[PDB]
From a paper:
A Mg2+‐dependent protein flavin mononucleotide (FMN) transferase (FmnB; UniProt: LMRG_02181) in EET is responsible for the transfer of electrons from intracellular to extracellular by hydrolyzing cofactor flavin adenine dinucleotide (FAD) and transferring FMN. FmnB is a flavin transferase belonging to ApbE family; it hydrolyzes flavin adenine dinucleotide (FAD) and converts flavin mononucleotide (FMN) to pheromone lipoprotein (PplA; UniProt: LMRG_02182), and divalent cations are required this process. Here, we report a series of crystal structures of apo‐FmnB and FmnB complexed with substrate FAD, three inhibitors AMP, ADP, and ATP, revealing the unusual catalytic triad center (Asp301‐Ser257‐His273) of FmnB. Notably, the structures of FmnB in complex with distinct inhibitors, together with biochemical assays, revealed that all three inhibitors indeed inhibited the activity of FmnB by occupying the binding site of the FAD substrate.
Numbering used by the authors: 37 to 358
Write the structure that this text describes.
Amino acid sequence: LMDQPYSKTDFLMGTVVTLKIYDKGKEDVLDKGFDRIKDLAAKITTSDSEKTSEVDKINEQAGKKPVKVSEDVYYLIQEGLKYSENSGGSFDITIGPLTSLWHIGFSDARKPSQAEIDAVLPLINYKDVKMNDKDQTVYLEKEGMELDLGAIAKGFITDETLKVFKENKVTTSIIDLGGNIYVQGNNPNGNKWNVGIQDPFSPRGSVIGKLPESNMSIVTSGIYERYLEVDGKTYHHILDPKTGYPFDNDIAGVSIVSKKSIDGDGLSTATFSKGIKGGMDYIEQFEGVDAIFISKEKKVYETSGLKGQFELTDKDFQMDTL
Ligand SMILES: Nc1ncnc2c1ncn2[C@@H]1O[C@H](COP(=O)(O)OP(=O)(O)O)[C@@H](O)[C@H]1O
Ligand SMILES: [Mg+2]
Ligand SMILES: [Mg+2]
């Protein structure tokens, strides 16, 4: 193991992405990782006017005909439908018509009018996604429907990147896709990795504290990471598919700790829909999954798996308990 890792940085999917590998001799696995990330993102993205992705193709054939898709996309949509069901539809990968409408995080983001929202809500229904395992085809049942895999793409890509790493016998590494961290192995000095917990009020990278972790995903969401501002008001990018407006409750930010990064992303949105007290309860129903919640009043909560493990460093915040 090396003290200083092999490191590469890029800007993809609208975020800074960095990979670090500490195993001597494996510098070329960084390119294998970024290659994989780029291949997955090209299949998944809807927001490239120059290329038609598999997701784009599914969307343009809504109500028309099923679409042959690759194993990567078929798999990701299957998992998205499970998270959709498991969430009670507060998370729904068919939110596409609604997220296209606000298009938060792009220079043309806007607050649509209620009448425009009302027109797209009847299109949001994960149950209208028709999978065929035999054919490996995906069919949206009604015209107008749009898939949006945004809320699970970085988790899936992280896990797929780790698979690339393990295939090349990488043992110690850090994968950072902006709002997703995976830490593999331990620090070369033998300690667990000290994972920063994001300060939801400050730019990405600022932290309120550290959580020691090894071989774990940490996924972070917050009310200010991608948002729109108009008339002195803020609209973040995690939308209520039943309302058309961003979830409004006491959560400022949440970091979810799990074995798989996709479960991190997956569980993120149903957690936002439930608030602090309800989101902790939801997370307590999932074995091997925990969370640190940060409320709008700057108080910090741990689920049972994590109780007493977060090390708070920012005095503006305070540990609290239900
Ligand atoms: N309720 C929802 N269910 C499913 N997907 C959503 C929902 N709201 C927004 N999305 C899509 O998923 C993305 C949110 O992903 P998330 O992981 O929470 O943010 P980040 O990209 O900062 O990690 C949005 O940008 C949008 O494309
Ligand atoms: Mg997510
Ligand atoms: Mg994410």
